């Protein structure tokens, strides 16, 4: 273990002020320009766009182009330029950080795994969601696949477990993950008609290939809208906040290039360009940077740390969502 943040302080300590509680939503595959407020065309995040509180960030750029590459870069101390995918596992991340300073770490995932991010930590921190055996919410489409709003449940139980200490939720989605985009909704979510069912997209019709996709998006919204909704539930005992954000883009056959996981030398924008969306209690008193702010995957943890009140040297003046 190669460590890079020994010298991290909380300032403040759950047991002097208010507990602190933040859900992560390590969001898949979701595209900044399909986000309605980034100026797309359709209204994809209609449930989203009415909780007051959600400052949208419309210049983010990604570390990578696929999950393996970007998962660790976001909780990375080391930022892009200097990330080495191949020796993340070993080097302290910021949740190890975190779990050293008695923020309790929980990490549900019902998209594939923590791509080595959790595996310093006890394996009870960690949950597979993809699976009926954790995930109440499977039986709700045709194919029995388990739902991100799953992975809501029972978090009151983490929380009475935990009560007074500060909490760290990292919730990673199943999204926009292709190329069976029309599995990842279910039937409320199909607004945008036809939609390619195939696995060959090349095949399908543009406009069916964008309409599921868009569709995978209306349930990320709602599953975000969840997770604010079950933070404020909390907001008296807790100062809440949720941070969102995809661990990359996806292409949706501009100039014939499909899904991701192209190298960064000469992946396309579409690869890299990444929604994030931010939401505290007025309470909190924490203050998102401008909606503007040239940011990266280097941000998230600067901005981690921030919100329990820790402070570590490396990232001292790097830029965060948040002031
Ligand atoms: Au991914």
Same mark, same amino acid.
């Given at each position: 273990?190669?460590?890079?943040? /020994?010298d991290?302080?909380?300032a403040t300590?759950?047991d002097? !002020?208010?507990?602190?509680?933040?859900?992560?939503?390590?969001?898949?595959? *979701?595209?900044?320009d399909?986000?309605?407020?980034?100026?797309?065309?359709?209204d994809?995040?209609p449930?989203?766009? /009415?909780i007051?509180?959600?400052?949208?960030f419309?210049?983010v750029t990604?570390?990578?182009?696929?999950?393996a590459?970007s998962?660790? $870069?976001?909780?990375?101390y %080391?930022?892009?330029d200097?990330?080495?995918?191949d #020796?993340?596992?070993? &080097?302290?991340?910021v949740?190890? =950080?975190?779990? !050293?300073?008695?923020?309790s770490? %929980?990490? !549900?995932?019902?998209?594939?795994?923590?791509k080595?991010?959790?595996?310093?930590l006890?394996?009870?921190?960690?949950?597979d969601? /993809?699976?009926? #055996?954790?995930?109440?919410?499977?039986? =709700?489409?045709?194919?029995?696949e $388990?739902?991100?709003?799953?992975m809501?449940?029972?978090?009151?139980?983490?929380?009475?477990?935990?009560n007074?200490?500060?909490?760290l939720?990292?919730?990673?989605?199943m999204?926009?993950?292709?190329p069976?985009?029309?599995? !990842?909704?279910d039937?409320?979510?199909?607004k945008?008609?036809?939609? $390619?069912?195939?696995?060959?997209? *090349?095949? $399908?019709?543009?406009?069916?290939?964008?309409?599921?996709?868009?569709?995978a998006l209306?349930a990320?919204?709602?599953?975000?809208? &969840?997770?604010?909704?079950?933070?404020?539930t909390?907001?008296? *005992?807790? +100062?809440?906040?949720?941070?969102?954000?995809? +661990?990359?883009?996806?292409?949706?056959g501009?100039?014939?290039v499909?899904?991701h996981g192209?190298?960064? *030398?000469?992946?396309?924008?579409?690869?890299?360009?990444?929604?994030?969306?931010?939401?505290?209690?007025k309470?909190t008193?924490?203050?998102?940077?401008? #909606?503007? #702010?040239?940011?990266?995957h280097?941000?998230?943890?600067?901005? %981690?740390?921030?919100?329990?009140?820790?402070?570590?040297?490396?990232?001292?003046?790097r =830029?965060?969502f948040i002031?």
């Open positions: 273990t190669i460590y890079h943040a /020994k991290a302080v909380q300590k759950p002097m !002020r208010k507990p602190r509680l933040v859900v992560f939503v390590v969001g898949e595959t *979701a595209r900044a399909h986000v309605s407020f980034n100026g797309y065309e359709r994809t995040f449930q989203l766009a /009415k007051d509180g959600v400052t949208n419309s210049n990604s570390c990578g182009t696929s999950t590459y998962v660790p $870069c976001m909780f990375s %080391l930022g892009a200097e990330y080495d995918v #020796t993340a596992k070993y &080097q302290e991340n949740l190890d =950080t975190l779990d !050293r300073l008695g923020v770490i %929980l990490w !549900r995932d019902n998209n594939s795994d923590s080595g991010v959790m595996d310093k006890p394996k009870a921190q960690f949950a969601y /993809k699976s009926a #055996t954790n995930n109440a919410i499977c039986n =709700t489409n045709p194919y029995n $388990c739902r991100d709003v799953g809501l449940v029972g978090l009151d139980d983490f929380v009475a477990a935990n007074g200490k500060d909490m939720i990292m919730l990673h989605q999204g926009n993950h292709g069976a985009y029309f599995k !990842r909704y039937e409320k979510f199909a945008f008609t036809p939609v $390619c069912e195939g696995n060959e997209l *090349a095949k $399908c019709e543009h406009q069916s290939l964008i309409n599921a996709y868009d569709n209306l990320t919204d709602d599953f975000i809208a &969840q997770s604010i909704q079950w933070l404020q909390h907001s008296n *005992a807790y +100062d809440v906040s949720m941070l969102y954000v995809s +661990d990359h883009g996806e292409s949706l501009e100039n014939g499909y899904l192209m190298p960064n *030398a000469f992946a396309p924008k579409e690869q890299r360009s990444v929604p994030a969306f931010f939401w505290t209690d309470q008193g924490i203050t998102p940077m401008a #909606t503007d #702010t040239v940011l990266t280097d941000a998230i943890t600067p901005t %981690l740390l921030k919100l329990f009140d820790v402070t570590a040297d490396k990232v001292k003046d =830029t965060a002031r």
